Amino acid sequence: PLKPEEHEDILNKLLDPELAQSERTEALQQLRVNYGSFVSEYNDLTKSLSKANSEVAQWRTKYETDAIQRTEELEEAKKKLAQRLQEAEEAVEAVNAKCSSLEKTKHRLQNEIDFYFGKLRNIELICQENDPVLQRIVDILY
Amino acid sequence: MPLKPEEHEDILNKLLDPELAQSERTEALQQLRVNYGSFVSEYNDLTKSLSKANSEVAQWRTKYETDAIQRTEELEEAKKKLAQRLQEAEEAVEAVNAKCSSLEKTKHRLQNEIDFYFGKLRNIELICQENDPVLQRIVDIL
C-alpha cells in the first residue's frame, strides 16, 4: 500500500488539467490497483486477526479448565495417600497396644515365677538345714 | 466508512476526463485524499489490534506453559513427601510387630518355667500329703 505522501503526490499530479492523458490514465490506474491491494491487505489483516483472537479464547478455556482439572488430580493423590497413611497409623497403635499388653503378661508371669521359686527355695533351705519324707523330697531334686 | 471499490472507481472515472471543471476535479481529488486517510487510519487501528491479540496469544502460550512445569513438579512435592512418611509408618508397624512376636516367645517360655516350678511344688505336696519334724516346717509354708 502507498504511504500517504506517495499517494498525495499522485493526487497533486492529477490536479493538473493539462496533464497528458497517458500519464493521467497511468495515475488513475495506479490508484485503482492500489485501492484494490489495500482492501485485500486489509481483509487479510481482519481474518489474520480473527485467527489470533480465536486462540485467545482457545487458551482462555484450554488451561483454564486444565487448572481446575490439575487441582483435582492433586487432591486425588492427597486423599489416596491420606487413606493409606491412616490405615497404617491405626494398625501402628493397634499392635502397639497389643505389645504393651504382652509386656504386662510378661511381668505377671515373672511374678508367678519368682513366687513359686521362692516357695521351692524356702523348702530347699529347710532341707539343707536338717527324716523319712525328706530323703524323698531330696530325691525330687538332686 | 472507507468507500467501496465501486464508489472509488466512480470517482476515478470522473477524474479521467480532461474537460472536467477544476472545482469538481479538486473536489474529487480531496475526496480520494480524505477517504484514503480514513482507510489507512482504520488499517492502523487494525494492525495495532492484531498486535494486542498476538501479545495475548504469546502470553497464554508461555504463561500457563510454565504452570505445566510448575504443578508437574509441585505435585511430586507431595507425591515424594508422603511416600516417605507412609514408609515410616509402615515400618514402625512391623518394628513393633517384631518386638511383639519376641514377646510371644517370651510369654510361652515364662509359662513353661511356671509349669516347671509349680510341678515340682505339687510333687513335694504329694509327699507331704502322704506323711515329720522337718515336714511341719515345710508345711508351715502352707
The secondary structure of chain A in percent helix, strand, coil, rounded to multiples of 5, reads 90, 0, 10
A33 and A10 Cβ atoms separated by less than 8 Å = no
Q: By C-alpha distance, which of A21, A16, A26, A22 is closest to B22?
A: A16
B39 with A42: Cβ contact below 8 A: yes
A133 → closest Cβ in B43, B111, B128: B128
CATH number 3.20.20.70 is the correct assignment for the domain at B5-139? no
A4 with B36: Cβ contact below 8 A: yes
B93 with A98: Cβ contact below 8 A: no
Chain A residues within 8 A of B32 when measuring between CB atoms: 11, 31
Which resolution, in Å, applies to this structure?
2.5
B138 with A117: Cβ contact below 8 A: no
Q: Where do we find the cell 486477526?
A: A49
Residues A92 and A79: their CA atoms lie apart, in Å, by 20
Residues A104 and A40: their CA atoms lie apart, in Å, by 96
Q: Where are the domains of chain B?
A: 5-139
The packing angle between helices B22-63 and B65-130, to 10°, is: 20
Residue A79, CB-side half-sphere exposure with 13 Å CA sphere? 6
Q: Which amino acid is at B12?
A: L
Helix (H, G, I), strand (E, B) or coil at B138: helix
The whole-angstrom distance between B64's CA and the closest CA on chain A is 7
A26 and A10 Cβ atoms separated by less than 8 Å = no
Q: Which amino acid is at B120?
A: K
Chain B residues within 8 A of A8 when measuring between CB atoms: 33
Q: By C-alpha distance, which of B7, B14, B40 is closest to A39?
A: B40
Find the closest chain A residue to B93 by CA distance: A92
A95 with B96: Cβ contact below 8 A: yes
Residue B32, CB-side half-sphere exposure with 13 Å CA sphere? 30
Q: Which amino acid is at B114?
A: I
A134 → closest Cβ in B29, B54, B134: B134
As for chain A, the residues directly before each break of C–N over 2.5 Å are 130
The whole-angstrom distance between B100's CA and the closest CA on chain A is 5
Q: By C-alpha distance, which of A122, A121, A104, A109 is closest to B115?
A: A109
Which residues, other chains included, contact A86 with Cβ-Cβ below 8 Å and sequence gap of 6+?
A: none
Pick the CATH number of A4-140 from 1.20.5.400, 3.30.420.40, 1.10.230.10, 3.40.50.880: 1.20.5.400
Technique of determination: X-ray
Chain B residues within 8 A of A126 when measuring between CB atoms: 134, 137-138
